[PDB]
Amino acid sequence: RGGSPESADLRALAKHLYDSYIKSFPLTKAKARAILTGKTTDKSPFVIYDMNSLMMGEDKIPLQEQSKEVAIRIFQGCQFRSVEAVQEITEYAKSIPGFVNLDLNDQVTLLKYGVHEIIYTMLASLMNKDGVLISEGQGFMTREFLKSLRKPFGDFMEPKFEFAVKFNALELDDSDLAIFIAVIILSGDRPGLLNVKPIEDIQDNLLQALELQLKLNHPESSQLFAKLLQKMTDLRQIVTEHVQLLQVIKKTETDMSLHPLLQEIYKDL
């Protein structure tokens, strides 16, 4: 197997995924880390560290906002970004070979469960210990300022920060993440799946592409792949918090009104 045609084919799959990923997701990790660590020559993100700076940066570039309190205005924006995300992930999923040929209801189910874990995964790219990059790198909202927000809003992100800190320590790049993300979407153990075997078949192929990618791209980290498989369970565990915090719009938050798409992804889960 070492350097056979099958291994060459696993690289072709990896590159295909990575290209689809470049195309699906406008801001990549490489681009996000360049801004986060102040490497760019040209970037200047707007920093939101308090209520006043929030007033200033809010209109980076109408009647969506109304006259609502800050914590709610913020999470209205969080709802939209996340709808953009779901749409990009959906498009990315469709580029995974074999995906569009699965039963359509199984596609749905896979996205329904996979999308939250992928949001958590990709958000880490946009986070350091201090805050998170927003509006494609045009803004940065501090962790501290998000903590200052009234309950329940003030501790939405905090768990996302904690996950990000530990996941970022693994130093995956965008080519590693493309395969990892695909593996997550093609999970054969979601509830309600009709045809589990063709899904497990695509995933096993993806898991192998992943294993090879990590050996070639991270030759000094012998346990990386084992660590990634562990983050997969972690993700399943963290996402239930997220799922529940978005049911808080049952009530209170009688002025929230959840985005129709997010409602669909949350219910009967």
């Binding site: 779901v86 749409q87 959906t90 498009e91 469709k94 359509l104 209801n105 596609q107 749905v108 996205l111 329904k112 129709p260 798409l261 669909e264 992804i265």
Partner: peptide
């Protein structure tokens, strides 16, 4: 499946 379906079907 409604909305996710719709996204999944749209050539795009």
């Amino acid at each position: 499946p409604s909305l996710l379906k719709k996204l999944l079907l749209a050539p795009a």
